[model samples]
Target: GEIEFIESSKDAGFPVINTPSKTKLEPSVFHQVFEGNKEPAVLRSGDPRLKANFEEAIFSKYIGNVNTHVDEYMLEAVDHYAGQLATLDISTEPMKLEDAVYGTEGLEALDLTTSAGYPYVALGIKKRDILSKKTKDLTKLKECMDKYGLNLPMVTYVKDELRSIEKVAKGKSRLIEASSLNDSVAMRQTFGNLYKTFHLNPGVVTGSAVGCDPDLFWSKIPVMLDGHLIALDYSGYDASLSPVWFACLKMILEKLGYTHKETNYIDYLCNSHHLYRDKHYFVRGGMPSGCSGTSIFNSMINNIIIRTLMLKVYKGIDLDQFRMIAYGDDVIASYPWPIDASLLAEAGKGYGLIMTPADKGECFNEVTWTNVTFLKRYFRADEQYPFLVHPVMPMKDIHESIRWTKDPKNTQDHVRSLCLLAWHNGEHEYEEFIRKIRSVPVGRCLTLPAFSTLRRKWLDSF
Candidate 1:
């Protein structure tokens, strides 16, 4: 949560902010003046007031040229990445428990003897094996499953719940709840059984690739460059997509050697959560955050949809114009021109991806796009009294240090240590730093027994 300071006060010679207040902006005369009229009408391009407002709000503090930051090479790299991904076989095939299986020697290779009371299952594979183009040996993997006791009781129980699972999978159900006793059981039962099999899924494989090759993920596929970082946020990104996308991801996983059982277990877990408000047992759309494969699954879906739109719908628009870096639903791009909000909205809906209204804008200044703010410059030695303000000099850290000290004597020692550290490293002088420390509410109340030791030893010494 973003902390907002409301009022300022001075304590002991240091400025301090008072306790904060949260306020709702009720409709008022000011609001009416700017937003009372509902009718839409085109404002004249030459309108003086509009020009003045735009200049004051957007262009007044503009500091850099947008054109110079463009990278033509990066744009070419994005198109090539998209083209390669577009060729992967995608389908609408249904998933089943039989589809889940292990790789060649996947189970035999497991050192399950160390599998203790908690996780109940353990398997290891080289990162290279998961990333290779060769398909896993599911036949050998299945043979070893029984030898290693890899079969789960939930698989049988889940079979009985197939009707409910199918309903959730089809998006016909709104609320769902897990029947497991607790989170630990839920994890051990669901993830434990599918551990070896799920690892072989394309989504997990792709996620591993992202961690191993962030340069390829960010720079090549979802292109990013200076000035071109467009910030895009989606509303209910995972929840809004259709089940078809899930099916597509499963299909790719199946092709990669994930068995029907493995995919079914995943689908069952995905659809088996308790609905928030309704409290009814039903499944959900889009990938749940808890799944190991979510990161790559979501990225792959976005890539496929965006690439298709680039080649088909926006044929005239240069693909470079829309090269973006996406994290789940948040997309950032650097476009020379404003993105068409209406076109994006329509294209996204076709793929069950909904764009939030606020994110539908032409362009934003770098600071605004990045959601960053510069509070103050540091280490400016040209001033009359030059010093470095420690980034950790916050009231929270000071109070936490005080709270962490258990004994009164230890508390005094802790405060003294902090004060000495601040005096030497902080931008403020010894006296100024002491005053700042005393300014906090907790610092000011030294008469209390809890703080008396710190007060007597540290503040009295001053």
Candidate 2:
């Protein structure tokens, strides 16, 4: 019941973020998570499983009910997904209740356990993040997880692993995101050397990008997949899709020196998540979708699964024939031969994982698959690009890029002013950066559509 709102301190040099106030967290859902009775696999908006320690949770907020009103379809969707989560079949010996939560002074230890602060509005992802209470929640969770972990910031581990995969990445892999594409004279000239680096002659060495579907529960919040209301499916880390976190996550925790009690505690907390949608709180199985931990969870688990090929190899597939770069659920694979969707599907079937060839187009609105993007950077790994380290350029042309990149910092800062334009491409609310860029221009060359010659000339002076 007591959650300190603002805090910043390091423990043993390990940073701890204050837990989000239980006030914002619907108390009703949680009490039920600890007390109410429900099927092990199926969960309602506010379902019971865990035992609550505090009386406030039991007496004040009964959590036993949500008054949640869903159509028959959502109920069926929940039933279908709950059944899917059941398929995972993971067992954890729950940590001793007292040891599970040894009360820490002034710190919401449970807050340390969450990731991705809040759920995005369907595909409505905000481009520029502004600070606020919820935004602070995001900062607290992400900073501690990504930047301040002692052994690993789950993202860095897999990111570095993906980097390491390229060290011995023979053959070519398709570059893609979980999604972006642009083509112009600037593109061809800029990415002209893509083929020379990887050296996979077109069809000789084949690769493809894989992305999963968020086809399960849309919650009380209506989901728009391609403008029509989407039916049920599962995303890479759909919380409601699984009864427990990835089995690989549990495996990795043990490898990282987490004890049986400790690992199960983490799983318990993750499994005890509920969503606040349409001002009504509901529980879905698996990880919380909005948590950054979910991202790292997805990342670490995906990395763990790929690095150890037992699942694939157990299926008698020669997993060694391919190199994998998995960023969370988005997997980019390079095969010595042309591997089709069915093969990719077969590679993961042993672990109850499915594969989708994202070549069709971007779906799920916000972060769809691009032919070449990951971790906010675009990559070219096909017949055209040779090496992996090359970066992208947006002229709107190459000479302008050359002018920009090679320019001095003073001028470069001014040149970056145009970057806000791209944000405006699919932008809803205009950001301050755009106006800030336009507000301060280097010279008359600041206006849009100014001659490239003049822009280049101005940039050249740097």
Candidate 3:
């Protein structure tokens, strides 16, 4: 063809790009803002300290290159508020749970030092007690206020911002406190009082600043009591519909004649953590939200429904064995033996929900044997399901550290990872680590179809 068309031009193929030689794009100006912020520095790869905050290490692995953006925006916001609060004259202290709900009154009768609420309570007490102020005691309080950046009015403002943000987060950002003290009695007294205040009011709180661990207030809440039900204020986002959601849950439970019984079996209540707490370093470290929060209820309801039924069908069971039983939609049923299908279906129907069983024949066998029992010997001849509550994993990114730790080979993997830290910094290191992790094999087994199919069979069995 070329010889025939001698006058024609020569043809060329598609252009090739040498990516390795191409200069990487520079980060935006906003990225430069975190250069000198007070937030923890992004530990470089190969640092010995990497294991201490391994989750942080993982975070930097994927998005480390863009971390400066995170740092920048965060630093800007923090600085903006820090400056505002630093100059403000404020006080902080613990207030009675009752007062937070009803408002302050009769403080002298109670022999109290301050009025209710945050800075006011703390400030009022500190001011009035000044005449007899013990220099050492006063200095201590001042030091605490200074330590947590409470001296700034911006700090209070930030707390208020968190309250608003948590409402949007659906109760995930909860206010919390923790201690490392050895004395259980003192710990109980201090945390017990605060817990009472928190359980009763379930809002912004200030209590004893026990330790310097940044995560002191960011500790995970363990489910301790039974018959706990989750309630939504609903006034914030869907005030009108909130009542409907509540009423629907109540009606469903009532129809089953299981409302009270359900309550007894309910060892934990669930909510989104971000909705009830501050966005401190620990809180935001593994945040799952990508501009918007995901509905845990939508994703995890089936497992919860299944587990709840197992608990109800079997009379005696220890609720404390389950971790994260009270938070969000994720349910980790740690059972040593099989579960009952009939019970699972009934509970599912009550809430107009269903469980997608993992296997058909096995699930059938476990449920049909009416006299079937597990954990029975331990319960003194009581028929209990052999389900052992297992440790829970966070459904979102914020808890990647926990999830990673739970892995069987986590320790070995961590040890191997130490060598990579030295060469990687920011995002580059994180990406490489993640790439290695992705190489690990994962398999799936889908045995059960939808709940509708199981529901039909379950009803037929009864």
Candidate 4:
């Protein structure tokens, strides 16, 4: 045990430390040190004002319907969108849709279910087959790259980093820590195969390393339109589409040396509580998340497939009337007409994509789309009509406050925590709170000069 401890200490670059004693010091000396050190103070617990402020900011401000300005805001948004789209030249090339050729039949045969007691189906794949196919594709890709004089896009490998640690100190039991692998070799390898296959095709490869930046493009577009900003999201997007259908995608990319890659093998966990080994599957659809080119390739193909199907379903109508943008599985569209959920669902099924049904009474007026609160923005924005500011309440801020306020064994700790919370939540509103905290009666052990030292120490912690 001693040897193990030594090894661990060496690995960590430090020896194990004993818990420090909780001893109260002279108030005057503590105050002098705190003040002299010019350290910041942390807010203490049991402050009703802090809780009240949090409640007002988070709860009271969020209640009720802010619908008065939505109609006008959306009308303005449509005008803005029209002007933006007009300046932009996008090709409406004719798209061809064929019967599901890749793995549609196999997908139909799958009997998929979810842990939440829901029936669902997913295209299965075999891992070994996918690897073999990728290997072959990579070779072909290399030849194509040389022939076309095109260089591969830069690939950055990120080192896996520890996210967090959860452990029980009270019980004498084993502790397990979870972490993610950075620069995953498996992901990188798969990405190479997809990158070489789709790099030259701009329409198919829109996000991540491709020329198009979705964020920059979407940022300029307003969120409101035609009295509604419709956000159409997919249900189990990647899982629903059959990898066999990717055969169609390969056919489209054939101009760029794309060949059908059979993605049948899937790696999954046998046990959720503990990681012993991975289980394999002969999946019919797309690969799971974290695979390099899965999202981009799937989204591109789905977009093409969905668009073509929609065009057929709504023949003689100009689909261009709707402002539509899709990244990965999330689809945002602004329509001048009422959205036909049934029509959209029908088209999506033909391509193996399923649309999640909206609940009763859920519509544009009350629904949040693409992480943006449409109603909240209309009510919060000023008369000048500037872009909406998404509320910023980071989890780290709450965690930091919790860490300090949970333990205040002494007056210094109490005062330090009080100041910390006030400073963190914006000093303007907490001025009175800070004054009250400072006026709390303490022994003569606390003095101005001594408090300075404590203050300095606390500031050093930051």
Candidate 5:
């Protein structure tokens, strides 16, 4: 009964499929049309437990069926935040203020939410002369909350509390002193640690003496001390990795808010796209292979899948409360709200993959998915479903998933077998399938090649 083709215009970069009727067709919709035309199966009747919202379940199934195709857009949304942070000037400016609120010397192991970590706590004392300090007023704070789409009252209370605490905690306040060998030593140490752990290719270690405009370097470079030279350890390499160092510097400068009037030698070094060296590797490879293209593609795929699945699987759930992680064969869905956490986690376990635990916070009930990752479960009084989401992947190396991909078919087989196992272990959906499919087209024609192809593709895509 579904419409055949929805004709649509192609986006600038890639070829997008459109239906014959000029309707925009997503990849999932395209595949659905293709399958329906070739072999129209009866609408699935899911388990009795799912009867209340079997339609929702079917929609989720369809969305998961072509996740990679939809994941490209999701990463773009996340990257908006990444880009904001990436552009900020975090470079340690000339020490204007420093109060070590939480370390060996002061409030040791304090929570980030505690009073001491307040933005104003960078200064131990709040001045009575409100004009001198850039204190956020109630109106301004409310405006900021509205602009950022944040929970207003909670944030306002926290900010006010922090301001009050700043006045109370009148401890020593001055700029944190810089390490004498700040930039050079840190750079050397970071690079040395990276190289010592692995066997890099021959040209990986070559340092470079690339020339750049002086103004650009001064504006972007995070360098503090003088007499720095951009020199290469090896002269034979065609292009250099110096832009990376410059990007880092620029990122720091942006965070710290430095001003540059004239263009300098470092201008040539500033590349917005440099920090994204591993982006390509993420996209095409689904692993951070240190290759630029693969990383970027991997992120795109993840974003697309997450966005689509969120729309499909969590349509009723609050979008702001849920989080999506696209790492490997595993996808982590988390909800900040407690009731939603439980439901999502239960659903995830029902689906066969354990929730990643790193995402759990104080408000969450923790469950172990594996040694590497765990699930944080949250709940709310009025909600029927608990919320859950993953915070981070445990593995330090980004491409661990790629290494596991050597036996792709075997991995997939194992996943499929696990699904069967989950079904056998009393997953409600499996029971329904067994009972309902007997009279449906899928039950009778499941053995057919056309049906088999659709089933196989559906399973693999998810």
Candidate 6:
């Protein structure tokens, strides 16, 4: 009882926080910046509205809260994919049967698209082979699927996500996000039904911005997501190296006391998603844009791997502090303690999935999964409020409104959503814009015999 003193050191607890020094901007600054920058608020690169433009995409990019610190958190991922593939039992034989790709009904069958070097004959595939066989036999259909896509190159394109506005020199900081939209018209364009031909959908739950309402986030979160506080609004979350993490997914599930049959089934589904894309890519990696399952599949891999890393780093701690709310390729990760923003993506990479890191020095006070022309939202941590901010009258949204309403042949049914969407973000000023919208009318704004006036005259009505 006499010696009750315990030793303490600077090294105690969850590492010293450098974020306070690095994250220079505060929430107060964001509110101030957005409030002041309100006029000419709609962006247009002088192009006609009705459709989203590259300019709005550029202007809406997140421009604030850039952390200028030296890079933080990392993993040196060595490839283990080759080993994983050899062990899994999958066959293209099921893909070989006519029923595999084209099941006939009333003497009518289907079509196809993609790879694996079946000795592709260059550019001749598209012009020469398209609809070459909706009437062609299964062998010919399978033939095009394997041999054709060899020449197709999947290109990654960057789109702006959030625009963080700056107080200095009126600078703009854009958060860049990318997607794998590419040279494969072969997806639904070529292949009619067998979207999967086969795969097991993963069980990672999500009420994400892309999947559902952004407002759905609060209701299902911190409980359905199993978290408490401090959400990291994230992106760059492409699902990479599954089935690499595939066997690991199976192993982790089974060892953690999951039924082997279910694990095997789940493993099979992911294999279908990854391997078919891999096998078809013929390039040994990647999937086409249509194989959208990868986005959801990443949720499973990201969660499993991320948890293990957190467990390792925190000495078997995988409870509340490591809570994550994932949707598609992004997450709203929460940990009550202030933590490094870089760890989540690095955690996925460390587990064999390729993920670029989340932003640093600051957590995004706002996150969006919608085109900026349609909506923008800000996060309030103090009251957990999602406020409509940076309310803009994106001419793109309004233009689209008229475009659909103007043409009976186009999607006229969408006129309501069109107005709802255009006004959705422009609540601050839709009143005046709506009045101008009424004055312009879909008739004058759209059917001008002179094609250029859509934007040159009608669009300026607001």
**Highest TM-score among the candidates is held by which one?**
6
Task: Give the per-residue Cα lDDT of candidate 5 at 243.
Answer: 27
lDDT of each prediction vs. the true structure?
A: 0.35, 0.28, 0.24, 0.32, 0.24, 0.32
lDDT of 6 by residue, 1-462 (tens): 011112221222211111111122222211221223321111223323213454334323211121122111111111121122223332212223343334432112232433211122222333225334445444444456565432333222222121223211132222121111121223222222222321221112221233334333333343443333333433323323423445544554344344565444343233221111111111211222234234434554455445545554555443434455444545555554545434644654454444433323243233232221111233322122342222334544344234322234443234333443344343344444444434533422432212233223322332
Distance from true position, residue 433, model 5, in Å? 50
Q: Give per-residue lDDT, candidate 1, residue 219.
A: 20
Candidate 6 lowest-lDDT run of ten: 70-79
Model 3 lDDT, residue 91, Cα: 22
TM-score of each candidate structure, all chains considered together? 0.37, 0.34, 0.21, 0.36, 0.19, 0.41
Cα lDDT tens digits, model 4, 1-462, are 000011233243332322112212223322432222211111112222232232122111111211122232223323333333333232222111111101121111111110100000011222222223213333432332244331111111111211112111111111111111111222223334344323333331232223232212222335433334555456556545554344434433432332234221121210011111121112223323433345555555544444454454665535445554445565544556555656767765654556754322243233344344211111122123244322222223322332222224455655544344333233343454344334545423333223334334433432
Residue-pair clashes per candidate, as listed? 25, 31, 32, 54, 84, 17
Error of 4 at 273 (Å): 23
- Residue lDDT tens for model 5, 24-112: 21222112211122111112233222223422322121111111221322333344323432342223332211111112221122123
**Where does candidate 1 stray beyond 4 Å?**
1-223, 251-266, 273-280, 309-312, 316-322, 334-338, 357-462
TM-score, model 5 to reference? 0.19
- Residue range 184-302, candidate 2, lDDT tens digits: 11111221222121121111111111121111111101111122111111123332223322444554445434466545533432333222212212232344333223443454444
Q: Which parts of model 4 have CA positions greater than 4 angstroms off?
A: 1-218, 223-228, 255-278, 357-462
State how far residue 121 of model 1 sits from its true place (Å). 18
Which of 1 and 2 is ahead in TM-score? Answer: 1
Deviation from native of the Cα of residue 305 in model 4, angstroms: 4.3
- What global local distance difference test value does model 3 have? 0.24
Which model, 1 or 6, shows the larger lDDT? 1
Q: Of models 1 and 5, which has the larger TM-score?
A: 1
Worst 10 residues of 1 by lDDT: 153-162
